[PDB]
Design a protein around this ligand. Structure first.
Ligand code: SF4
Ligand code: SF4
Ligand code: SF4
Ligand code: FCO
Ligand code: NI
Lengths: 256, 420
């Protein structure tokens, strides 16, 4: 009896798997366990093994991926959504463009035996029990859930914005001082504020959090003297959170 | 009506399969079915502002984020008329070389070698071949580290921006790098001599058409303005449509491609066959002593050409960090007037040629055309599997299903790239 972990895959850049892959003592890092299905790494992998942990990565973009996510919800006591493509539908959700106008704008009228669908989180069809965030997640975010899950416990989610860690590091607001639209005050954290800390704006990759605490003195004031309109913030929050229905009124608290 | 279906190919990037059709004559058709959902990176970005569409192209594929993103870059910058500052390209070439060093070393060591050693998983020869895998992660993590220094990351680099970089590092780091590169060249040296002793199978030898960007200066490189083909032809990188054409088939979400109405192969042998003489350093001598192994006549010589290039690209970024360091201190980025225009770039991605073609009108993206290297390759891939399927079909199926795949895994297919 060694805890069963499979790593299954949907529609992705496999960065979230790449991330687990390039962690180097990884098998010293999950010993009370066994890897049963990770096709990128094991050819001895089978999909219809009953597993204990189910790291599902990617969007549901083809119909048979509706068959897979239901398939794995059944052979798994825990289905963990890994990365923004599986947590949020990703960057393939930031257009509401119907599938067919997207088929025509790329394929014209040329049929593929396989059924494509608009992008959707894993949550739509099957129950997600936990969420590892980031595009891709941080090594420290994979260390946490695997190790905690494997001593028997349950993981939890950092509910504070990127701006807290941002400030910790001594990082100067590239928002206040430089006019870049940072999605840092509305993005869950964990990245050690990587993008402020490169003179770059937070682009949202770790997911939407809500702005229910007054971290900035007046973000509306900053957004009304940088020239950042509520619609702007929305197009940008939508690049990794285009299925959040909460966006439209979260940015509206900020300007109210 | 009694097929060989390999529902999934192991140790490649992406969701795909095979349907090898057996008849009574032998082998009818070979079908690589590719099921990785389109993500319509060519359309969802349309009507979106350039910067915003640009931080999104690298999420096509984690084995080649730098490539996509640094290519997106060059084509948005021919579009808006910008030109890179000189030490700022050298750094972009450097960042591309840690995408390259790592990709190969991850494909070769953790995807290819397991088949020639007996192992299903690379997570397995861990206490049986310890030194290789310690050689493995050393090359890979000079890779992984380089990208984490000049691009915030290995998967999707947010520091490389329009105009250059958002924070270049302290000088000492480009020196320590050059110090870690010099402590790597013996590691790729080992990897040459390992993958050359390996089998480039006979059931695949046969004539192939080999296409490659042509290096825009004196040396083997990545960037350049002229696609070359192995016949002895050359054509402007801006007319890739007017010289290569796409077509949809029902058996894949990825298009297929012809040069001269027939299959061709991009992806590192293609570069050695086409631009071998532009090399120097330990790599020139390794090609000029091991060439009956680096012929355009066998798929699997893709694997050993990778090993050779880790020799080249290690040494060239040594010189290229040196070139950058002669303009120090360097301003990170310069300002880019986003004016309207069109731009095509062709670069050598880890696997062959990546074309980005960008149109922007009024700050936003009105058009885009991407073709990635695995998509270019899908169609000679299928023929080279057929060729193996020919000489092995009435075998124990599981004796067959291993060797076709190795062939697949000899292109380093990257299916999240062939479907975008
Ligand atoms: S979340 Fe990002 S890194 Fe992870 S699979 Fe999706 S696109 Fe790739
Ligand atoms: S740069 Fe962005 S994350 Fe950092 S303090 Fe400013 S708003 Fe917050
Ligand atoms: S700063 Fe934002 S976009 Fe950048 S890594 Fe962190 S969560 Fe992702
Ligand atoms: N190498 C690589 Fe990815 C593909 N195909 C790109 O570009
Ligand atoms: Ni790729």
């Amino acid at each position: 009896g060694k805890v069963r972990i499979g790593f299954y895959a949907l529609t992705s850049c496999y960065g979230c798997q790449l991330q687990l892959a390039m962690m180097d003592e990884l098998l010293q890092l999950i010993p009370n366990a066994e890897i049963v299905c990770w096709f990128m790494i094991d050819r001895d992998s089978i999909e219809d093994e009953k597993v204990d942990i189910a790291f599902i990565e990617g969007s549901v973009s083809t119909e048979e991926e509706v068959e897979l996510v239901k398939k794995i919800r059944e052979n798994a006591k825990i289905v963990v959504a890994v990365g923004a493509c599986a947590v949020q539908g990703g960057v393939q959700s930031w257009s509401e463009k119907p599938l067919e106008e997207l088929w025509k704008k790329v394929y014209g009228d040329a049929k593929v035996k396989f059924q494509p669908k608009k992008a959707e989180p894993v949550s739509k069809y099957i129950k997600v029990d936990y969420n590892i965030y980031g595009c891709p997640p941080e090594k420290k975010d994979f260390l946490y859930a695997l190790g905690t899950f494997l001593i028997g416990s349950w993981p939890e989610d950092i509910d504070y914005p990127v701006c807290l860690e941002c400030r910790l590091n001594g990082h100067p607001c590239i928002l206040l001082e430089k006019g870049e639209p940072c999605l840092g005050p509305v993005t869950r954290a964990g990245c050690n504020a990587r993008c402020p800390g490169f003179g770059v704006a937070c682009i949202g990759c770790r997911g939407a959090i809500g702005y229910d605490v007054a971290w900035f003195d007046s973000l509306a004031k900053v957004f009304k003297e940088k020239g950042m309109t509520k619609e702007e913030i929305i197009e940008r929050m939508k690049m990794f959170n285009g299925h959040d229905e909460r966006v439209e009124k979260m940015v509206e608290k900020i300007f109210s | 009506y009694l097929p060989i279906t390999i529902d999934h190919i192991a140790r490649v990037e992406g969701k795909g399969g095979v349907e090898i059709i057996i008849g009574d004559d032998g082998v009818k058709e070979v079908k690589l079915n590719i099921i990785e959902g389109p993500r319509f990176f060519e359309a969802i970005t349309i009507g979106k502002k350039l910067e915003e569409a640009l931080a999104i192209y690298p999420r096509i594929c984690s084995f080649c984020s730098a490539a996509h993103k640094l290519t997106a870059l060059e084509a948005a910058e021919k579009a808006v008329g910008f030109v890179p500052r000189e030490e700022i390209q050298a750094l972009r070439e450097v960042l591309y070389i840690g995408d390259m060093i790592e990709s190969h070393a991850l494909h070769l060591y953790l995807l290819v070698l397991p088949d020639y050693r007996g192992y299903s998983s690379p997570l397995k020869m861990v206490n049986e071949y310890k030194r290789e895998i310690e050689i493995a992660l050393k090359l890979k993590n000079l890779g992984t580290w380089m990208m984490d220094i000049l691009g915030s990351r290995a998967i999707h680099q947010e520091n490389a921006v329009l105009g250059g970089f958002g924070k270049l590092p302290e000088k000492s780091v480009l020196e320590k790098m050059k110090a870690e590169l010099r402590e790597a060249l013996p590691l790729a040296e080992y990897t040459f001599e390992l993958f050359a002793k390996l089998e480039q199978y006979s059931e695949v030898e046969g004539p192939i058409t080999h296409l490659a960007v042509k290096p825009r200066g004196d040396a083997y490189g990545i960037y350049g303005d002229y696609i070359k083909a192995s016949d002895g032809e050359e054509f402007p990188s801006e007319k890739y449509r007017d010289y290569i054409k796409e077509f949809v088939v029902e058996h894949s979400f990825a298009k297929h491609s012809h040069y001269k109405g027939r299959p061709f192969m991009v992806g590192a042998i293609s570069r050695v066959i086409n631009n071998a003489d532009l090399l120097y350093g330990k790599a020139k001598e390794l090609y000029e002593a091991n060439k009956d192994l680096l012929k355009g006549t066998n798929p699997f010589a893709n694997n050993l050409a990778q090993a050779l290039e880790i020799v080249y690209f290690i040494e060239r970024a040594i010189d290229l960090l040196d070139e950058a360091l002669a303009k120090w201190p360097i301003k990170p980025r310069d300002e880019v007037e986003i004016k309207d225009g069109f731009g095509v770039s062709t670069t050598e991605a880890p696997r062959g040629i990546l074309v980005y073609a960008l149109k922007v009108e009024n700050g936003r993206v009105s058009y885009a055309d991407i073709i990635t290297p695995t998509a270019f390759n899908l169609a000679m891939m299928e023929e080279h599997v057929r060729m193996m399927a020919e000489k092995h079909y009435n075998d124990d199926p599981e004796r067959l299903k291993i060797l076709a795949e190795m062939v697949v895994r000899a292109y380093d297919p990257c299916i999240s790239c062939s479907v975008h």
